[PDB]
Amino acid sequence: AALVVDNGSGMCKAGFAGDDAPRAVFPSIVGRPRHQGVMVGMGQKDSYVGDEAQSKRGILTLKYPIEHGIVTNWDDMEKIWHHTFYNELRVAPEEHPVLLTEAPLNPKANREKMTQIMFETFNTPAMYVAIQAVLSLYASGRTTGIVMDSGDGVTHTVPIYEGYALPHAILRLDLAGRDLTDYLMKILTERGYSFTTTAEREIVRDIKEKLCYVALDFEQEMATAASSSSLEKSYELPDGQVITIGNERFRCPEALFQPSFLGMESCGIHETTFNSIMKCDVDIRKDLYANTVLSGGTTMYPGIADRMQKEITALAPSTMKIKIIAPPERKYSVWIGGSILASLSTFQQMWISKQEYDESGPSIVHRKCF
Amino acid sequence: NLRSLETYERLEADKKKQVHKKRKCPGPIITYHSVTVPLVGPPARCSRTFITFSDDAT
Amino acid sequence: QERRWKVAAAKKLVRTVVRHHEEKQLREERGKKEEQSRLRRIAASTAR
């Protein structure tokens, strides 16, 4: 079975093609000891990856090799791939093809480096690169539409026509779950709850993922929160202290629609999607409006689909049919799409073989992957 | 309820989309196509032929 | 006659060179568009 590896800015998902869910999901982080001298002598590993690094966050320095969807540390990315294959999947990469995902607008040099690493370091028999948004569209049984992908580090809107992403209309927004977590930390500090440590940052992330939601009408929700405490929810901290959260539940995710909350002059996700659709040909805009698929972990907020529908209906012409598609398992849409793609019998001829790499070099990836 | 009722009443749309498909089985295909096109400098018309190949190999 | 022939031959050769370079440039541009269309075709087949 071919291996599918989703290279996400916050979480890495890996599994076997044909499965309905990834087998391993762990943070894409590499940890190194803060004080080498004392701890090297006692046989301690030089670096920790994924869950092991997260569990030792009190003594390790954590670094992300992927920033805003772009690989910035190739050594750490190689270490993450090694950890995935030998610790998470426990398989020999030389015996199984590997399908890798890439962010939109991925530099050609990065694709060549990925191909070189996969063929020379892991001796993989075959490999394929697929666009995350394209896989997200594939996971929903659609081939023409626009995918709004918002992960941990970056948000992209990608219009796709018959499986082909339109590069001239792809828009990038440097706003995602991490910025929302920092904003929640700031507003909780403004309410009186101080979170300063990385452990407290992860507590704030858990609070965001468990209690935040998107309001249909921000002004009406603010008036309701100012007039009644019915929207306040309690969260029990690990030390037993119970904190009360009020309007922060919906003010934090509102930053996705109004980046001005963070001081950013960029357009919201709805305006970004509308602008991306407006950059496409008029004949395909009708298909794009009717096939807007939400993907990514940052799109898991309850009510986001209704708000997106309302905003697009208010922005799009009244004669256009608007339909927002929000799959329940949209956080795994990329991996599911990759598993579907790698499970097709016709796709077995699309794999880049080691012979083709040896004959054409790393540039074959640009003539085989789209 | 309409979607529920359509479990019985959606006789039209589903059958039309399942029967009048615009695609066929995988593999190489050569499409001969001939349509009426209007002449340029019923209206004046001429016939024109297009030949379409599924893949670059064929 | 030799002068007329040399002038005409020079014009012939230079216009052939100019057309040769025009053809090469247009062939490169058409190749780029062909590569784009090829990638689009592969995407369409996968979508099908």
Helix-helix angle A269-278:A282-289, to 10 degrees: 150
**Chain C residue nearest residue A166, CA to CA:** C40
Cα B41 to chain centroid distance, Å, stands at: 30
Helix (H/G/I), strand (E/B), else coil: A43: coil
Resolution of the experimentally solved model in angstroms = 3.4
Pairs of CB atoms within 8 A across A/C: 24
**Residues of chain A contacting C44 with CB distance shorter than 8 Å:** 162-164
Chain C stretch 19-38, residues whose beta carbon is closer than 8 A to a beta carbon of chain B:
38
Alpha-carbon dihedral angle through residues A326, A346, A355, A106, given to the nearest 10 degrees: -20
**Chain C residue nearest residue B25, CA to CA:** C48
Nearest CB to A143 within list C35, C42, C47:
C47
- Under the phi-then-psi rule, with left for phi > 0, alpha for psi from -120 to 50, and beta for the rest, what region is A295? beta
Question: Shortest Cα distance from C46 to chain A (angstroms)?
Answer: 7
**Would you give the end-to-end CA distance of chain C in angstroms?**
67
Which residues, at least 6 apart from A123, have a Cβ–Cβ distance to it below 8 Å?
A93, A94, A354
**Chain B residue nearest residue C40, CA to CA:** B55
CB contact under 8 A, A370 and C42: yes
| DSSP helix, strand, coil percent of chain C (3-state; round to 5) | 95, 0, 5
CA distance A81 to A72: 15
Helix locations, chain A, DSSP H: 36-40, 51-55, 74-83, 108-120, 132-139, 177-191, 198-211, 218-227, 248-257, 269-278, 282-289, 304-315, 333-343, 354-360, 364-368
Task: Check CB contact of B23 with chain C, cutoff 8 Å.
Answer: yes
Cα A180 to chain centroid distance, Å, stands at: 14
Which residues, at least 6 apart from A77, have a Cβ–Cβ distance to it below 8 Å?
A7, A65, A66, A71
**Which domains does chain A possess?**
1-132+334-370 (3.30.420.40), 133-174+268-333 (3.30.420.40), 175-266 (3.90.640.10)
Task: Check CB contact of B55 with chain C, cutoff 8 Å.
Answer: yes
CB contact under 8 A, C48 and B55: no
Long-range contact pairs involving A342-347 (C-beta distance under 8 Å, separation at least 24): A342/A2, A342/A4, A342/A17, A342/A18, A342/A97, A342/A99, A342/A128, A343/A2, A343/A17, A343/A18, A346/B26, A346/C45, A347/A128, A347/C46
Helix locations, B1-58, DSSP H: 2-9, 13-19
Taking alpha carbons only, the member of A342, A283, A351 closest to residue A138 is A342
**Residues of chain C contacting A143 with CB distance shorter than 8 Å:** 47
Question: Shortest Cα distance from C18 to chain A (angstroms)?
Answer: 32
Maximum distance among all Cα pairs of chain C, rounded to whole angstroms:
67
Looking at chain C, which subunits does it touch, using at least 3 CB pairs closer than 8 Å as the criterion?
A, B
